[PDB]
Amino acid sequence: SGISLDNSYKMDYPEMGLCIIINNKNFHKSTGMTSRSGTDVDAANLRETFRNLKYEVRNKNDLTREEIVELMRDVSKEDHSKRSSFVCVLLSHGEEGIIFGTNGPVDLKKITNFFRGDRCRSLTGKPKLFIIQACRGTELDCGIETHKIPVEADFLYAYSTAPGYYSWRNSKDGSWFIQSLCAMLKQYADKLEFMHILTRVNRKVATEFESFSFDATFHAKKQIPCIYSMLTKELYFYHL
């Protein structure tokens, strides 16, 4: 045939792949962690958004740290040969490098290690997307007025907030980041490459949201998400 180009991931396998959504709202009392009002809005929005992208969505609620690790291990041991990609969304409390099960923390590196190129062979060479709505620390942004492949290749981490910073969640509307992510996927997934969709998410969160609080420490604060890409190709959710 004619000249060919190979700059984009193959997304025309029989299945787009799994979308695992872990939605942790209620935490064991002994942890002292607050309930995450608004997270069900996020989980429902994500389920619908990724359904319309033709992902096989699995929603899981209020998982312990042990259940999170066993779920991720089990999913990584499925046969993904007929799937184009893998998506995991984590909605919980967090700190830098950590997301919380209902009874204690899980290392993000432990979760993602299950999907390394050498440990999940049916996802080798395929994009592995981790979308994380969770705090990464306690800083607040005051704003300003205006052949082999690496085992860590083909991962993308879409973080809601900058490293070291809190992440913001509205109890009525859902989190700033997930609200914005679903809106941009709905509008642009048939149009734009995924990095460019996520850049529009960055702009939406950075420009349209600002916290309101009776507590001066927490009032009038801003947020910028962080795209962490080890992808090796362009990612389009559509194919020709």
């Binding site: 995450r36 608004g38 913001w168 969640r169 509205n170 109890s171 916290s211 609080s213």
Partner: peptide
């Protein structure tokens, strides 16, 4: 607005 709440923090995670």
């Amino acid at each position: 607005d709440e923090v995670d």
